[PDB]
Design an enzyme around this catalytic site. Structure first.
Site, PDB file in Angstrom:
ATOM      1  CD  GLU A 147      -3.080  -0.910   0.059  1.00  0.00           C
ATOM      2  OE1 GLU A 147      -3.100   0.110  -0.652  1.00  0.00           O
ATOM      3  OE2 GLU A 147      -3.938  -1.857  -0.091  1.00  0.00           O
ATOM      4  CG  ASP A 178      -7.854   3.748  -4.710  1.00  0.00           C
ATOM      5  OD1 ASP A 178      -8.284   4.061  -5.814  1.00  0.00           O
ATOM      6  OD2 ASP A 178      -8.572   3.114  -3.896  1.00  0.00           O
ATOM      7  CG  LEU A 224     -11.797   3.844   0.073  1.00  0.00           C
ATOM      8  CD1 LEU A 224     -11.327   4.442  -1.215  1.00  0.00           C
ATOM      9  CD2 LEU A 224     -12.656   2.606  -0.163  1.00  0.00           C
ATOM     10  CG  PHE A 279      -6.043  -3.632   3.878  1.00  0.00           C
ATOM     11  CD1 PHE A 279      -5.596  -2.719   2.972  1.00  0.00           C
ATOM     12  CD2 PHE A 279      -6.017  -3.326   5.237  1.00  0.00           C
ATOM     13  CE1 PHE A 279      -5.147  -1.493   3.363  1.00  0.00           C
ATOM     14  CE2 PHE A 279      -5.528  -2.087   5.635  1.00  0.00           C
ATOM     15  CZ  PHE A 279      -5.106  -1.176   4.704  1.00  0.00           C
ATOM     16  CG  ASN A 308     -10.257 -20.521  -9.471  1.00  0.00           C
ATOM     17  OD1 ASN A 308     -10.854 -21.011 -10.450  1.00  0.00           O
ATOM     18  ND2 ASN A 308     -10.872 -19.766  -8.613  1.00  0.00           N
TER      19      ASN A 308
END
EC number: 3.2.1.17
Length: 164
Positions: free
Chosen positions: A11, A20, A32, A104, A132
């Site tokens: 981050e 972002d 955020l 997160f 996957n």
């Protein structure tokens, strides 16, 4: 390595409001603020979160405070989510961190929709789960971060973060 160091790598740390990777106003270590395109709305959210008029700036200590709250909320959120809790509790402590990382980044409801990947993780079919997981908007939009998280699920080691 631990979840805080992992997410700090993924981050970053910025003390001024920024956008972002999705274009949303954020601050700190991936906190955020709002999905609103209004900067004034983001500034209001920031002041509410910190408890003072910040005028779009915070200190490192304030960033770290928000970060601790956000990590704890991601974890407790997983535990409160009927789709995520059994998968989480089936994992080892390194793979726990990979799941927390995803929540997160994209929220609990988003990760709980990775239904087939979650099943493979619960089944400890690590290479299959890795394949996957990569069949996702997530991987396509943030490939380097997703590759690190996926390697963490595949291997149950910190190899993708040790050296960073």
């Amino acid at each position: 390595m631990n979840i805080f160091e992992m997410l700090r790598i993924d981050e970053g740390l910025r003390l001024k409001i920024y956008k972002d990777t999705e274009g949303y106003y954020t601050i700190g270590i991936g906190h955020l603020l709002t999905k609103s395109p209004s900067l004034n709305a983001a500034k209001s959210e920031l002041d509410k979160a910190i408890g003072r008029n910040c005028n779009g700036v915070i200190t490192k200590d304030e960033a770290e405070k928000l970060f601790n709250q956000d990590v704890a909320a991601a974890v407790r959120g997983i535990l409160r989510n009927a789709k995520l809790k059994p998968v989480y509790d089936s994992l080892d402590a390194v793979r726990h961190c990979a799941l927390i990382n995803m929540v997160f980044q994209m929220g609990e409801t988003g990760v709980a929709g990775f239904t087939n990947s979650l099943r493979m993780l619960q089944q400890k079919r690590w290479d299959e789960a890795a394949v996957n997981l990569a069949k996702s908007r997530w991987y396509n939009q943030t490939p380097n971060r997703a590759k690190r998280v996926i390697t963490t699920f595949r291997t149950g080691t910190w190899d993708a973060y040790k050296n960073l």
